[PDB]
Amino acid sequence: RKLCSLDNGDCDQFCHEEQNSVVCSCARGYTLADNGKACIPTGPYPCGKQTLE
Amino acid sequence: IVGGQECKDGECPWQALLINEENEGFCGGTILSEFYILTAAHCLYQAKRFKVRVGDRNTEQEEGGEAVHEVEVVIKHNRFTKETYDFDIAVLRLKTPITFRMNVAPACLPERDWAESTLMTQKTGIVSGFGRTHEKGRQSTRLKMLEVPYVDRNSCKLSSSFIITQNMFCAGYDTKQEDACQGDSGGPHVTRFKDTYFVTGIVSWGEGCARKGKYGIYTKVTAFLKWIDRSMKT
Ligand SMILES: COc1ccc(C(=O)NCC2CCN(c3ccncc3)CC2)cc1OCCc1ccc(Cl)cc1Cl
Numbered sequence A: 001r002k003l004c005s006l007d008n009g010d011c012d013q014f015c016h017e018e019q020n021s022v023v024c025s026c027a028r029g030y031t032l033a034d035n036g037k038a039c040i041p042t043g044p045y046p047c048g049k050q051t052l053e
Numbered sequence B: 001i002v003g004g005q006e007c008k009d010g011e012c013p014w015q016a017l018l019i020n021e022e023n024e025g026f027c028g029g030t031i032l033s034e035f036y037i038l039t040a041a042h043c044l045y046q047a048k049r050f051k052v053r054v055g056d057r058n059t060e061q062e063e064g065g066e067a068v069h070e071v072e073v074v075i076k077h078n079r080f081t082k083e084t085y086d087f088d089i090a091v092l093r094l095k096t097p098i099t100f101r102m103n104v105a106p107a108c109l110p111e112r113d114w115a116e117s118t119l120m121t122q123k124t125g126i127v128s129g130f131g132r133t134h135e136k137g138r139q140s141t142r143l144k145m146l147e148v149p150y151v152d153r154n155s156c157k158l159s160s161s162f163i164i165t166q167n168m169f170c171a172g173y174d175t176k177q178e179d180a181c182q183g184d185s186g187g188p189h190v191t192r193f194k195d196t197y198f199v200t201g202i203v204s205w206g207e208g209c210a211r212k213g214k215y216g217i218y219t220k221v222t223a224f225l226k227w228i229d230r231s232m233k234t
């Protein structure tokens, strides 16, 4: 368990190793945060999130 | 859905229902985006004309959330065959865009490699639908959800009286009485990751419902991501 094999590389979503190094990315509807790991929703109903009140 | 629990308010917002000219639901579907619905190819032979309903959790009332949409285009996978049930997948283009709200949102589409290494390696996934609650009973009026354990690929083939192709996969239990049933076809199979749900499968087929020694057979979504993108791009 090294890079993405280690807790998904601490990425919120998609994780892939570009040159022995973690590179995170997000699904359509989100934008990569400044920290390069989190995924910030771009609207009120981002994909894959349950809608609660 | 045999067993499982019912989808509570906003727990399965990506569920879509295919309804015939008589207004009854025969198959499920997954909201991919405002204009797109993911379903099962085999579901396209169970009706001449059909519409798609979203935001419904009870088929015998009006929670005001419901909404019917007409299918503009029906993109079915040309390599689909009844003889084998391989390539059981289809995409639907709606004439009007879905309005996201409470109980109506889309499931995310994952990257193929990541999905394959992080989503399908998870312990479980979730299947949902308005299908039968028992193998012999009748259609369910409440949308239900069921956690289905990912099954070892080897074990899967052994239990199947039919050849499991690389475009499918088993989910469910060997003996526990929980599984999808008829009427859930084309419905959602999502996998949770850090509070986010990704489309991982399409309720395809099974030899009965929850029968001992059998599993539910889903369409492997990661095997058609590029096909899906292409289907949406146009
Ligand atoms: C009340 O329910 C059923 C009674 C008899 C059969 C029955 O008759 N089964 C035989 C079929 C199985 C699929 N077929 C093939 C044929 C060749 N290759 C692969 C699949 C055609 C025969 C199927 C039933 O429903 C299957 C419901 C189901 C459970 C779990 C998941 Cl995940 C999906 C579904 Cl749709």
Ligand SMILES: [Ca+2]
Pocket (backbone or CB within 6 Å): B056, B057, B058, B059, B060, B061, B062, B063, B064, B066
């Ligand atoms: Ca209703």
